[PDB]
């Protein structure tokens, strides 16, 4: 059960998000090329480090 | 998402050979480059698809 350091590259425009949660674009800290979009609740800005568990799955709306 | 990117890129290849709505296709191509460039230069399988769509365009 490893842990993944990641960072927000870009917050996303018009997801139509239910509630204050936000779909965001992250790029890895280790495999910095591998960049996906995932789901984040709460206040968030661009360009900042995060910590996750499940990297393989792509987060939906 | 980047899982959808190769499907989109292949469709850009289809429109490139079957030329329709040229500025639309070019603009969306450039945009997906600038939002995914490092993934693009890091990947391997896309290189062939990019070569083909490049010839077509």
């Amino acid at each position: 059960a490893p842990v993944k350091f990641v960072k927000v590259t870009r917050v996303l425009g018009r997801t139509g998000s239910r509630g204050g949660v936000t779909q965001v674009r992250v790029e890895f800290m280790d495999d910095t090329t591998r960049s996906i979009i995932r789901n984040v609740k709460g206040p968030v800005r661009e360009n900042d480090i995060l910590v996750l568990l499940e990297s393989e799955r792509e987060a939906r709306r | 998402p980047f899982s959808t990117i190769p499907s989109l890129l292949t469709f850009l290849n289809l429109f490139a050979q079957r030329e329709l709505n040229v500025p639309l296709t070019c603009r969306i191509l450039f945009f997906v480059l600038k939002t995914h460039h490092k993934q693009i230069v890091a990947s391997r399988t896309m290189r062939a698809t990019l070569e083909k769509v490049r010839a077509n365009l």
Binding site: - | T4, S7, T10, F11
Partner: peptide, 17 residues
């Protein structure tokens, strides 16, 4: 709904291809 709209539209187009 527009992004996922054109997304699964692309997906069905891939199936047809």
């Amino acid at each position: 709904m527009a992004g996922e709209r054109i997304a699964e539209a692309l997906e069905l187009g891939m199936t047809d291809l």
